[PDB]
Design an enzyme around this catalytic site. Sequence first.
Site, PDB file in Angstrom:
ATOM      1  NE  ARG A   1      37.361  43.384  42.866  1.00 51.27           N
ATOM      2  CZ  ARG A   1      36.393  43.808  41.954  1.00 51.27           C
ATOM      3  NH1 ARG A   1      35.371  43.141  42.211  1.00 51.27           N
ATOM      4  NH2 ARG A   1      36.770  44.844  41.062  1.00 51.27           N
TER       5      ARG A   1
ATOM      6  CE  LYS B   1      37.999  47.882  44.437  1.00 53.68           C
ATOM      7  NZ  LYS B   1      38.690  47.955  43.191  1.00 53.68           N
TER       8      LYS B   1
ATOM      9  CG  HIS C   1      42.549  39.893  35.672  1.00 51.16           C
ATOM     10  ND1 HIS C   1      41.788  40.621  36.468  1.00 51.16           N
ATOM     11  CD2 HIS C   1      43.840  39.685  36.230  1.00 51.16           C
ATOM     12  CE1 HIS C   1      42.545  41.205  37.101  1.00 51.16           C
ATOM     13  NE2 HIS C   1      43.797  40.960  37.019  1.00 51.16           N
TER      14      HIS C   1
ATOM     15  CD  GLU D   1      47.674  41.690  36.324  1.00 44.39           C
ATOM     16  OE1 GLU D   1      48.274  42.632  36.830  1.00 44.39           O
ATOM     17  OE2 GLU D   1      46.400  41.477  36.884  1.00 44.39           O
TER      18      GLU D   1
ATOM     19  CD  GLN E   1      43.649  41.367  41.089  1.00 48.00           C
ATOM     20  OE1 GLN E   1      43.701  41.842  40.113  1.00 48.00           O
ATOM     21  NE2 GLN E   1      43.167  42.021  42.520  1.00 48.00           N
TER      22      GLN E   1
ATOM     23  CE  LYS F   1      43.859  43.393  34.666  1.00 49.76           C
ATOM     24  NZ  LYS F   1      43.471  44.177  35.555  1.00 49.76           N
TER      25      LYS F   1
ATOM     26  CB  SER G   1      40.715  41.594  45.609  1.00 47.35           C
ATOM     27  OG  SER G   1      40.932  41.597  44.057  1.00 47.35           O
TER      28      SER G   1
ATOM     29  CG  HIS H   1      47.141  38.124  40.092  1.00 52.68           C
ATOM     30  ND1 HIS H   1      46.436  37.536  39.328  1.00 52.68           N
ATOM     31  CD2 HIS H   1      47.050  39.489  40.038  1.00 52.68           C
ATOM     32  CE1 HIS H   1      45.905  38.618  38.636  1.00 52.68           C
ATOM     33  NE2 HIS H   1      46.216  39.895  38.888  1.00 52.68           N
TER      34      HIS H   1
END
EC number: 5.3.1.8
Length: 440
Positions: free
Chosen positions: A303, A309, A112, A137, A110, A135, A108, A284
């Site tokens: 997303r 989803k 966070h 990452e 997306q 989040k 996706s 991203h």
Amino acid sequence: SSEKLFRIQCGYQNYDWGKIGSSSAVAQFVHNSDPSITIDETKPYAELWMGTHPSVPSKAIDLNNQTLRDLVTAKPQEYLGESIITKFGSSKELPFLFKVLSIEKVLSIQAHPDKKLGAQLHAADPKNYPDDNHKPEMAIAVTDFEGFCGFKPLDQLAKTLATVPELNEIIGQELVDEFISGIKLPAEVGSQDDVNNRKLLQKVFGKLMNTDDDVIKQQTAKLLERTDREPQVFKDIDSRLPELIQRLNKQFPNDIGLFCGCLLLNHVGLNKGEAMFLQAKDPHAYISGDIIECMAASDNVVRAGFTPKFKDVKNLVEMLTYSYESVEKQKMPLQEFPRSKGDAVKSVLYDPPIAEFSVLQTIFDKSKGGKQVIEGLNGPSIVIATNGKGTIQITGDDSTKQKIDTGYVFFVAPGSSIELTADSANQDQDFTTYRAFVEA
Ligand SMILES: NNC(=O)[C@@H](O)[C@H](O)[C@H](O)COP(=O)(O)O
Ligand SMILES: [Zn+2]
């Protein structure tokens, strides 16, 4: 059964985008570690989760199969240490979640949440936003990798807006003009010129993301046709771009991600061993490859494309910072790691500017082999072998010696010095491990 160095059997996610069956590094590692698990050869194996996040447990196979989360929760002082308990605010869990991803189709589009949005989303919709954490990452390429990461620089976006008819039609000429006239460069981050640039980019992105799906289907079809009839329009923006659009459209026909990923976000390639970090809220979408990922302990994600989803376009549009900094700024320099010494040909710290983790890579040459010794680190660690085989033990205590083959995962308690050894009856696979850890 030491409680300092011990095997964990980790859960996995069968998300749609995963590599299928035994072609997946997740499936390979899972099965290797527990040959009693039957790999479903028709299913995607997308993510291996190594951690204490409640959504997927890790189990200590020689400690009566209790979950890592439970073992931490029972002995926080031993498993976390006071410094980690205090800085991150929990007696129950690791502040990081460590993963292997094995990617067949793009993820996706997306982003966070940061801490503030984390708390707000969780409060408003705890079903879809299952914890209150941020989040940030990091991804390390295990095979060659591609992904989308961050908005393209504004001059590239202006070019795209002016030269791609199907995007220009969705945004509308008045808004395209407003964007291209209005942007000012150079702009220092924080300056009023920057603030205004970001507001303009948000206007363009919101107009796209809120477009009716039937319009998106019509324009994607025409975009695809144009990549065939006029490839050079696309190559002038970036040489890989027409092929990218074609390849992702085969995965997700007529998806909005063909505009919002392919045309607005940097297309990043990482060679094996190269890495990148993403602060909270960076937009991203990972495209291809097998990777190590490490993040703050959360499964919050907003997303907006390339996925069946749950999508939340409105939160996505509202949360992004709209930064357009060059993506090179988040490719990581590899660093040395004084606290590890020995025969390993690579010993490499991936330490991004994110408090919750670092990752140490160790590689022994297949023929040379040998031994590496790492001091006790001041917090909990997870080690995975991604290639080859060897043995792992607590330094100086030979009774703790255990086989570590490809896919085996071990927890290492704070303070515990580790010694790794490459297999010697062997000369064909470089024994390779990644260790996620954290220190206040
Ligand atoms: N950047 N990668 C990640 O954030 C992964 O760890 C997460 O698990 C993502 O949420 C996986 O992508 P989907 O939500 O399935 O589209
Ligand atoms: Zn992500």
